[PDB]
Amino acid sequence: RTTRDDLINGNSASCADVIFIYARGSTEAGNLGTLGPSIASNLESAFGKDGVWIQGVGGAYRATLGDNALPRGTSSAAIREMLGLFQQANTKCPDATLIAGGYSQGAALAAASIEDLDSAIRDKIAGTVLFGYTKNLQNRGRIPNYPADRTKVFCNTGDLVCTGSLIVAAPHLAYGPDARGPAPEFLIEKVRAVRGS
């Protein structure tokens, strides 16, 4: 279950109401890595398999560990890849509500992409979850240009990347419980807040 390309594969004539775009952590497998599958299963329970499209950021995003040290905490090629997926969602399914997330390098990628996005598309992302956010200190827990009420950051005590370092310590690898419960809970709540049900 570590690769999902529902947006790329999806039929434009039968668009899902909710599209989730997720970026994995460094060196992780597929395009969802270790946390994305848990979030996806719970979104599908809430909205149904036909109700939500799960899309990982693959393509040019190689999730190379060394790219954590670059200015935006990931590469320019990776940002272009995720921007392209938000633009594909907006073109293919203009009425869908979007939600996003990322872990570790993927959280820096999600923040850089949303910062650069056209505002009319950015404003369709009803909620974003970030785990082990490598730019947490530098950005003061926020995503630039995106509202605090639509953001949820999961940063464990002792996870040094949340406090301005790039050292990987054991708390960085402990976000499994959050991806199984509070992170899908937040995303579902933020989609229902604007779509009703």
From Swiss-Prot:
Recorded GO MF terms: cutinase activity
Compartments it resides in: Secreted
Keywords (A to Z) from UniProt: Disulfide bond, Glycoprotein, Hydrolase, Secreted, Serine esterase, Signal, Virulence
Domain of life of the source: Eukaryota
Regulation: Inhibited by n-undecyl phosphonate (C11Y4). Inhibited by paraoxon.
Post-translational modification: The 2 disulfide bonds play a critical role in holding the catalytic residues in juxta-position; reduction of the disulfide bridges results in the complete inactivation of the enzyme.
Main EC class the enzyme belongs to: hydrolase
Reactions catalysed according to its record: cutin + H2O = cutin monomers
Sites annotated Transition state stabilizer: S26, Q105
The keyword Hydrolase is assigned to this record: yes
Swiss-Prot/TrEMBL GO biological process terms: carbohydrate catabolic process
Ligase among keywords: no
Temperature curve summary: Optimum temperature is below 30 degrees Celsius. Optimum temperature is 30-40 degrees Celsius.
Residue numbers annotated as active site: S104 (nucleophile), D159, H172 (proton donor/acceptor)
InterPro entries given in the database record: AB_hydrolase_fold, Cutinase/axe, CUTINASE_1, CUTINASE_2, Cutinase_monf
Outcome of substituting L65A: Increases activity on p-nitrophenyl butyrate
Biotechnology: May have promising applications in chemical and textile industries as it is capable of hydrolyzing a variety of substrates including soluble esters and insoluble triglycerides. Can hydrolyze and thus modulate the surface properties of synthetic fibers such as the plastic poly(ethylene terephthalate) (PET), or the textile fibers polyamide 6,6, polyester and acrylic.
Enzyme Commission number, as recorded: 3.1.1.74
Protein family per UniProt: Belongs to the cutinase family.
Annotated function: Catalyzes the hydrolysis of complex carboxylic polyesters found in the cell wall of plants. Degrades cutin, a macromolecule that forms the structure of the plant cuticle. Allows pathogenic fungi to penetrate through the cuticular barrier into the host plant during the initial stage of fungal infection.
Protein name: Cutinase 1
Organism from which the protein derives: Fusarium vanettenii
